[PDB]
Assembly symmetry: D2
């Protein structure tokens, strides 16, 4: 079908991109970076994340594929040496697709902005102390005092979530996971401490106590938000689709990245 | 229908049990502790766990209810003062039921024994060092060296799992969670560190490296197993059923138990 | 001798300050906020920290005393009701002094700035990724990738250090403690993970890998530093002195603040 | 002077031991395993620990040396290839000695037993729940509910202590460090959570609440103690002495063992 290729931009990835375009030129494939049906990312997980966010409005019509030119990534799980085999199998098609859940973040003011995350969304203060009330399905759960909070997708659990002590979740589980950044706990201030894993349709709301300015990140993007009244997290109804051509199980991918490869 | 009541055995719980039996005597209810359809547990979560394991062969035909005479429990979520209202609403019936997932443990030798857990199943060595190979869906994931491992149900995540750094999972998620006990990590021995959350139909297998004797716990029960060839964990096909009479959300229950009440 | 009083500035603390000044007026005491020999802090630990940094150039000639008008502080360990008894015992004098160690931070550029910390000094990046090489007594120890690092005094171990998983150290131990903020660990990036406790005369040096701009905090003060070549930590030769009038052991202070009071 | 050599007992270590004995036969050295002045340990840290405990009554008159035939140890820090150079430099003498602190454990009954630890001493229950009151210098600090507690020397901080989240302490610091094993924390049960570092002359006492039987380990030795009234921890007055022949800094040893070598 239609396809496009994004590159990390170093010499290795650009040349690999040109060679795949040349190989694709031998098949019934059209290069189209406006309405592609296949998006190939050549680089690392950062390059893949930019590809995802470049097309996050046509997620239902795109299958993503990542090629890692540096270290193995959790999204870029093809070696450059297999690019020719990848061109061939992609050109025929008849691959099967795999879907991972995504996280929806809603930021309300006094309008409203929504964001989609593949890895996670984090909230920190704009300099001063970070205090928010944590509201779960309209029930006041805790008053969090600390550095910040992180809400992760299942596939994001191997990223910032993991560094904060969160669990690794298999991406077939439609959930999101909330982890704390350096929470203050004494006899007057109390947080749950543990990571919290929320199912689909649960809404986690962050509500300011004093300051209403927050630094909110969504994957690699970080924006300073002002006059915030609420930050809303829930499992998205939208999903990212991967073209898969062989067996590379998530738990094997975790093994290769953190234990040995 | 038919019902039975188990008591913690202290004076408060026995008297409360006799009063509920007397109140039940005013309705179309029969006391039957062989084939009950309702099992009432009066005490704490330990009393409730014994009730669960007393009838773990009729789980499809029983709705459990817990009354806490001491501190609030995650399973015993009725106060003793509401016992009269509980008798009345139970006698009419037409309550609705809630189901939590359970964990299946299979221990193979050179026969085979299976166990059902409501909270968790743990494995430790019989004195010497604990070393096992961790196999996930037939893929060798890690060689674990440490004190032991804990596999928790969702409702068990607030128990031993929480003390080991595991995430708290909403019990509507059909999953199990594996946490490490004091893992050894240096440049030659490597574990994942993080808790791992597994979906339904994933099989986690523990396989001995040297010693084949292990102390295996299932909820409160702990047995020394000898000549073990494999320990197998998976989400059970069976589920525990709760009679629910009002709204007491899991996250509110977590708040009441760990933040304040 | 000479004395001064700093106030949190709310109504309660200012009035308490005026009453102590009036009570001090009945003794051989002179109010002098240029060269005081006693510095009284009325408020919380933040107020006490500002008092410390106000006079950090006359530390050898000052004994500090803290009165807590809100919650109990680790430095402000007098209740407001005892202020009259505090005035009386201070006026006579013949109290005994207790000294806590301090942390010296040196920031070098391409001049050089030094800072003294009572609680801790932290380093984070100026937006992008934080990567530094950690050098211990000229030996290259690790390449740290994460959110940042925190170096704490013994009395600071109950503050940010504690939130990052650090140990609590009795302040009679002349040491500093380095803790990690969300370190990245995989098969290519490796940090020690554990907190590190360094004795007097050990020098811990942070050296940039790519970016040379860092946000460095010293207690409550946080400054963006540019063109940094090295950040140097060591136990200071200078110490803070407390006037003590009764027994309030550090471990009792820890109990009162985190377990119950 | 007088010397003896202990071996791990595998072929490699025994042969290395015989070759060093033969090399020592060319100098003014006498093999004496009753009153040696030098104790050489050939194996790993377990072999070294047995050598330490074999002679823990002549600690003032012995300098220890460890040769690692397997992986690098924190106590066995000589390679087998340097054994000939080790024999030569040892025979002349005029090496300098380094001392590490040790932990004293006192177990009282209704007589009293004392133990010396090079790594750590741990306390667990004999099957049932572990509950002890933690008393610091006669001040009741906390009621600990969990799996157990671990008190570590500075050089022991890289061992079990590290696996429990404890800090790594440079062994020039005369201290001990207490870490928790899976503590239970909810709104009714409260522990400090953090590791605690105690200076010389502080006494940490564990006192039973219900059960009085405990499994107490001291380094590799683990004994079931019955009718215990108190367990007492303090930095020992005795110290282990190492013969050192070159520079191998503790922090470099930590780097080699956990980061890379
Ligand atoms: C440095 C830095 C930030 C992380 C870079 C690597 N990375 C990106 N995304 C992921 C992910 N989902 N799982 C594991 N690793 C990931
Ligand atoms: C002491 C001890 C063992 C734990 C007793 C309390 N307890 C039992 N089960 C649970 C559970 N599922 N969640 C939270 N708390 C629980
Ligand atoms: C919020 C916030 C920041 C911390 C405020 C309380 N605080 C200040 N200093 C300390 C300290 N040394 N030990 C314990 N608590 C402390
Ligand atoms: C398996 C197992 C138990 C630990 C074996 C290795 N080991 C022994 N002692 C130490 C120590 N002091 N520091 C680091 N590693 C040590």
């Amino acid at each position: 079908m239609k396809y496009m290729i994004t590159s990390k931009g170093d010499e290795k990835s650009d040349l690999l991109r040109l060679n795949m375009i040349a190989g694709f030129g031998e098949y019934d494939m059209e290069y189209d970076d406006v309405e592609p049906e296949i998006v190939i990312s050549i680089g690392g997980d950062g390059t893949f994340l930019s590809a995802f966010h470049q097309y996050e409005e046509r997620l239902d019509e795109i299958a993503f594929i990542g090629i890692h030119t540096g270290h193995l990534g959790f999204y870029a799980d093809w070696r450059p040496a297999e690019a020719d085999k990848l061109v061939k199998l992609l050109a025929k098609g008849e691959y099967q697709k795999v879907s991972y859940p995504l996280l929806k973040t809603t930021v309300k003011y006094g309008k409203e902005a929504t964001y989609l995350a593949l890895n996670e969304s984090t909230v920190k203060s704009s300099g001063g102390p970070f205090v928010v009330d944590v509201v779960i399905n309209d029930i006041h759960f805790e008053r969090f005092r600390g550095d910040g909070l992180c809400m992760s997708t299942p596939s994001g659990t191997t990223a910032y979530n993991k560094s904060l002590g969160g669990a690794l979740m298999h991406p077939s589980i439609e959930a999101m996971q909330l982890t704390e950044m350096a929470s203050i706990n004494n006899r007057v201030y109390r947080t749950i401490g543990s990571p919290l894993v929320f199912p689909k349709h649960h809404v986690v709301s962050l509500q300011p106590v004093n300051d209403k300015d927050f630094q909110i990140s969504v994957d690699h993007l970080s924006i300073l938000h002002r006059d915030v009244q609420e930050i809303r997290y829930e499992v998205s109804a939208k999903k990212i689709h991967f073209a898969r051509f062989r067996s590379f199980p998530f738990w094997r991918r975790v093994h290769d990245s953190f234990i040995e490869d």
